[PDB]
């Protein structure tokens, strides 16, 4: 019952770059890259990546590849008191697989509802109000009103979401059966992809993680061909250095690069804990980050050449064109542009196919992380029957995601999106980094990497893991630890108890860390000093 190695080196190099690009690089990077300057954002993206996302990535990979013991059981080899990080990251994975598969369910609904020769985004039919309809730009007259909504917006907020039947978080009764049986298929695909561990979760990536690129190439070609591409690409690449002065651009760049590379979420550890010992853990940790960045860049080109075509057709500049959140920016304006493209009913099928494929492998990885962690944590009650407990984690994530699929829908999805990824996950990552760096002496963390690869890490990573990463994580924590949450999606002001609910959701994490710290300090005997010194050092039997 040894660690099942990957099929090939590319079998893991592709899995990690499939896990990297999930949804930020496809909708949030351009939306966050035009609000913050446009050209003055790529520099605080690169000089923030190289300082806070790539070193953490390489540290996670090297740690998982040397220790080869998962995420929750590696702490008994790093720092005993910090074993609560595993339970915290399991709770985090529960919340995030709860709020994350709803977007894939919406994408699958759009896919299965786009087979009609005429896409249901150009006309204005029963479930799509006409009193506020007609805002689609495919009209000769210049009639416009600040209350009019495009037919794609009504399709997104009245057919798939049915958000008109929910006045907010105060009442969200009624479950969308057409989505309830739509997310069940996605969870079935997830379970049948990670029902054997890695021997199939790697082979599925050979088609789930490289297919988004094959679709992005043709979509980029079609967007550049569009009449009005340059009017959008210029705005995408137009620098506004007066925006770089404000710290908002730096905060947004740090948050985006961290939550796009995703280091320390207990998944890179579980992945590196599978490949061989002498594998090159540097040439795959240095290529994944640049591949993710290039993917975000190309997808930004795609999204904004489409937005430039739309703005040039609507006889209005790129501003005041679909200024809302990410999922709206991908399901309303881009859907309308696809419905108005010449060869319709084909640029929607492949678009939603790529949109669901670059989320499927990401969720595969996010669940496989905690699966491997809990598996190699208890190798007696588990690790003999892996066919089970994957059904268990899938049913748990599904029953948790049954609240985001009600008629409320986005009203809970936005909350769990901007509350379950706040200072809880970042505090978990900061504690992980300070445990691997400060507590666990980095001298040993360099000796083991040298004996594993063949050369010690350079002076660049040696100074970063101790001074830059634990500082650029403390900064990214204290940044929006004081910012007022003002979610306000679909002109719906959230109540004040929503803030307390978000605080409690954040407290659901980072409570396991002190819980286990106390539970471990009480058991060990002696005075306080020896009680500390005992459970700081690894076991090393």
């Amino acid at each position, epitope marked *: 019952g040894e660690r099942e190695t990957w099929g090939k080196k590319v079998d893991f190099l592709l899995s990690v770059i499939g896990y990297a690009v999930d949804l930020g690089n496809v909708w949030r990077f351009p939306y966050i890259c035009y609000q913050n300057g446009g050209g003055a954002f790529l520099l605080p993206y690169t000089i923030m990546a190289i300082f806070g996302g790539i070193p953490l990535f390489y540290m996670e990979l090297a740690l998982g590849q040397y220790h080869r013991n998962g995420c929750i059981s590696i702490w008994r080899k790093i720092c005993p008191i910090f074993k609560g990080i595993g339970y915290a990251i399991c709770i985090i994975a529960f919340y995030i697989a709860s709020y994350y598969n709803t977007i894939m369910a919406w994408a699958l609904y759009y896919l299965i509802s786009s087979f009609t020769d005429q896409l249901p985004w*150009t*006309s*204005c*039919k*029963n*479930s*799509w*109000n*006409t*009193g506020n*309809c*007609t805002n689609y730009f495919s009209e000769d007259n210049i*009639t416009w009103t600040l209350h009019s909504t495009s037919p794609a917006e009504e399709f997104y907020t*009245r*057919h798939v979401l*049915q958000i*008109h*039947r929910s006045k907010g978080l105060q009442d969200l009764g009624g479950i969308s059966w057409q989505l309830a049986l739509c997310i069940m298929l996605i969870f079935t695909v997830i379970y049948f992809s990670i029902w054997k561990g890695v021997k199939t979760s790697g082979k599925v990536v050979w088609v789930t993680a490289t297919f988004p690129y094959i679709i992005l190439s043709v979509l980029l070609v079609r967007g550049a061909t569009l009449p009005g591409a340059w009017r959008g690409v210029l705005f995408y690449l137009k620098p506004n250095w007066q925006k770089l002065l404000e710290t908002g651009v730096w905060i947004d760049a740090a948050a985006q690069i961290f939550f796009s590379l995703g280091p320390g979420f207990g998944v890179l550890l579980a992945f590196a804990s599978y490949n061989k010992f002498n594998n090159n853990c540097y040439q795959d940790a240095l290529v994944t980050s640049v591949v993710n960045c290039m993917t975000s860049f190309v997808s930004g080109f795609v999204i904004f050449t489409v937005l430039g075509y739309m703005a040039e057709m609507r006889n209005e500049d790129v501003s005041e064109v679909a200024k809302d959140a990410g999922p709206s920016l991908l399901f309303i304006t881009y859907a309308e542009a696809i419905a108005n493209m010449p060869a319709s009913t084909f640029f929607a099928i492949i678009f939603f196919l790529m949109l669901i494929t670059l989320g499927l492998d990401s969720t595969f990885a996010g669940l496989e992380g905690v699966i491997t962690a809990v598996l190699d944590e208890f190798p007696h009650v588990w690790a003999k029957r892996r066919e089970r407990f994957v059904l268990a984690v899938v049913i748990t994530c599904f029953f948790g995601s049954l609240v985001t699929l009600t008629f409320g829908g986005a009203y809970v999805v936005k909350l769990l999106e901007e509350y379950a990824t706040g200072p809880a996950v970042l505090t978990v990552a900061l504690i992980e980094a300070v445990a691997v760096s400060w507590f666990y002496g980095i001298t040993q963390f360099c000796r083991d990497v040298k004996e594993m690869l063949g050369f010690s890490p350079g002076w660049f990573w040696r100074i970063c893991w101790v001074a830059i990463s634990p500082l650029f994580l403390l900064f990214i924590i204290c940044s929006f630890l004081m910012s007022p949450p003002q979610l306000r999606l679909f002109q719906y002001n959230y109540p004040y108890w929503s803030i307390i609910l978000g605080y409690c959701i954040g407290t659901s994490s980072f409570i396991c860390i002190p819980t286990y710290i106390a539970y471990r300090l009480i058991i060990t005997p002696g005075t306080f000093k020896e009680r500390i010194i005992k459970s700081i050092t690894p076991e090393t039997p």
Partner: antibody, heavy 118, light 110 residues
Framework: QVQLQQSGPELVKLGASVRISCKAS????????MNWVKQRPGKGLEWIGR????????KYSGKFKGKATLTADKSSSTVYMQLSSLTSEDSAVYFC??????????????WGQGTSVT | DIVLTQSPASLAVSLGQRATISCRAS??????????LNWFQQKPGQPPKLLIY???NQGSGVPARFSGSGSGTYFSLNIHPMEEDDTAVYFC?????????FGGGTKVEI
């Protein structure tokens, strides 16, 4: 205000064809349906067909698709329905109902005068 | 094609009683929350003026006598006690796709 107008009455001939017109004004007619009903003398209303000026989406019911082909002329703010094979049963009035927005439940708010054929 | 059964097809109600008009169907025409159905009134020699949106919401320029209730399959028109001016035929025109249908009409009089 919203008001609709139609043509005058015609004569029912065996196998002949008649073109019932229906105007529209006071609203953006390129986004509201233009229904058609047949209220035979003595009996209740009967739905003939449907049209959506701006997309050409037409619906029918019960062979009315081969007997009444609807046509929308978005230029003169008029909708047509070219009847054919006028059987003695087709000697009735032909209202031109305007279906409202979809959120209201497709309400046939405003109705034409009625182009009775005998 | 949906069947719209109406009953009673004739209400011999006088001035001062709340008459009722039922309207059943196979569906389950409740769609997207707004129950797709309407209620009309065809006075002798007049176009069918509309009464109720979605079997619950009032029309335009109509007194509050003609109420509305029901959801799913059973839709009812509980008209307030009226006088002899509202003697006409009332239809139950659903709007759930794809082909709409009209009821049989329930003429009312004293």
């Amino acid at each position: 205000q919203v008001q609709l107008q139609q043509s005058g009455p015609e004569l029912v001939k065996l196998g002949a064809s008649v073109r019932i017109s229906c105007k529209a004004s006071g609203y953006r007619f390129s986004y509201s349906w233009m229904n058609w009903v047949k209220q035979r003398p003595g009996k209740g209303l009967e739905w003939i067909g449907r049209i959506y000026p701006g997309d050409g989406d037409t619906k029918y019911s019960g062979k009315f698709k081969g007997k009444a082909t609807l046509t929308a002329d978005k230029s003169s703010s008029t909708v047509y329905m070219q009847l054919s094979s006028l059987t003695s049963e087709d000697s009735a009035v032909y209202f031109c109902a305007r279906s409202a927005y979809g959120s209201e439940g497709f309400a046939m708010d405003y109705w034409g005068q009625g182009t009775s054929v005998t | 094609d949906i069947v719209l059964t109406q009953s009673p097809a004739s209400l011999a109600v006088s001035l001062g009683q709340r008459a009722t008009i039922s309207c059943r169907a196979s569906e389950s025409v409740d769609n997207y929350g707004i129950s797709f159905l309407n209620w009309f009134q065809q006075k002798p020699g007049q176009p069918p003026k509309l009464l109720i949106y979605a079997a619950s919401n009032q029309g335009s320029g109509v007194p509050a006598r003609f109420s509305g209730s029901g959801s799913g399959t059973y839709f009812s028109l509980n008209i307030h006690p009226m006088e002899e001016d509202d003697t006409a035929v009332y239809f139950c025109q659903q709007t759930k796709g794809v082909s709409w249908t009209f009821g049989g009409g329930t003429k009312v009089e004293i």
